[PDB]
Design an enzyme around this catalytic site. Sequence first.
Site, PDB file in Angstrom:
ATOM      1  N   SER A   1      16.025 -66.727   8.442  1.00  0.00           N
ATOM      2  CA  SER A   1      16.660 -65.507   7.971  1.00  0.00           C
ATOM      3  C   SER A   1      16.135 -65.122   6.592  1.00  0.00           C
ATOM      4  CB  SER A   1      18.166 -65.741   7.875  1.00  0.00           C
ATOM      5  OG  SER A   1      18.893 -65.482   9.042  1.00  0.00           O
TER       6      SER A   1
ATOM      7  N   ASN B   1      16.330 -70.939  14.188  1.00  0.00           N
ATOM      8  CA  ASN B   1      16.587 -72.200  13.500  1.00  0.00           C
ATOM      9  C   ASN B   1      16.888 -73.332  14.485  1.00  0.00           C
ATOM     10  OD1 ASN B   1      16.243 -70.804  10.978  1.00  0.00           O
ATOM     11  ND2 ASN B   1      18.432 -70.602  10.605  1.00  0.00           N
TER      12      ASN B   1
ATOM     13  N   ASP C   1      22.009 -56.450   9.028  1.00  0.00           N
ATOM     14  CA  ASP C   1      22.730 -57.689   8.681  1.00  0.00           C
ATOM     15  C   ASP C   1      24.233 -57.476   8.475  1.00  0.00           C
ATOM     16  OD1 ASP C   1      22.722 -60.500   7.228  1.00  0.00           O
ATOM     17  OD2 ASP C   1      20.565 -60.030   7.334  1.00  0.00           O
TER      18      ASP C   1
ATOM     19  N   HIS D   1      25.301 -63.380   3.385  1.00  0.00           N
ATOM     20  CA  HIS D   1      24.033 -63.341   4.149  1.00  0.00           C
ATOM     21  C   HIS D   1      23.186 -62.091   3.926  1.00  0.00           C
ATOM     22  CE1 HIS D   1      21.351 -63.461   7.713  1.00  0.00           C
ATOM     23  NE2 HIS D   1      21.225 -64.756   7.404  1.00  0.00           N
TER      24      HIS D   1
ATOM     25  N   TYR E   1      10.565 -60.702  21.646  1.00  0.00           N
ATOM     26  CA  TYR E   1       9.936 -59.473  22.132  1.00  0.00           C
ATOM     27  C   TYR E   1       8.584 -59.259  21.434  1.00  0.00           C
ATOM     28  CZ  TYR E   1      14.501 -58.444  24.187  1.00  0.00           C
ATOM     29  OH  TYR E   1      15.729 -58.579  24.810  1.00  0.00           O
TER      30      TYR E   1
END
Length: 274
Positions: A220, A154, A32, A63, A170
């Site tokens: 997230s 999102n 992050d 974040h 994936y």
Amino acid sequence: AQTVPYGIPLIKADKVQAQGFKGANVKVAVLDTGIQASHPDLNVVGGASFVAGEAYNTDGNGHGTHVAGTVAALDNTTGVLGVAPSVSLYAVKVLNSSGSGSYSGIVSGIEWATTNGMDVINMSLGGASGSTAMKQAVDNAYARGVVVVAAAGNSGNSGSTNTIGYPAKYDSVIAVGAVDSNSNRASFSSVGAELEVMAPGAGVYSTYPTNTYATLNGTSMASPHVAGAAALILSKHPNLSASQVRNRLSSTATYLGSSFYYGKGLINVEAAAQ
Ligand SMILES: [Ca+2]
């Protein structure tokens, strides 16, 4: 003095914790924007930065700190509580201050985690496009025994449109979608075939840059709940493989409706944990 975000009880992380399993000896890498390593409710043990001009132990964007919070805010008499408070936390800065990063910084972070022995990789972080390099890192890491978790996206839903991002798309990576405190799917969660599990993603209270706590929304926020759940399981059954840990999570999730909008449903760490 200590607050218990609704998220921990909802996934029944509290129950695994009560038994005395809190991710001790499990190494989690959070990929992050970094982590305010000085926050008093967190204990960052190391990492690296793949971003020009910024260490790994500062977060100029809240974040990464908020996500780090959901995995591991210490169990004490202050702040919040993380799903796996005894985990070994690594901050890997692959995103800049504004929240973006390059595939190359991203693939670097993955490779550093595989190499440095991380057990779990949280990537709260998406992209409309993958690459050949990215797919390789993730596949390899997974094959090399790392549990890879990522936010699904999102992008909401629109007809039968698949809106899941990279790297969640994936198949070596667990795509996490978001629910609220009433276990209802949040409007912002991406939808599609690849969606695997749901975790709390609406109104999640956590650690936030400069020794404070804040509420955020997103996939997230959902993803670290699953990264944490992985670490709980591992502290209970250290013998298990990545695919075994993965199957536990999806095969014991609470059914909420159609796989397209919910995957296998909301994770239940108590059932999963065995
Ligand atoms: Ca705390």
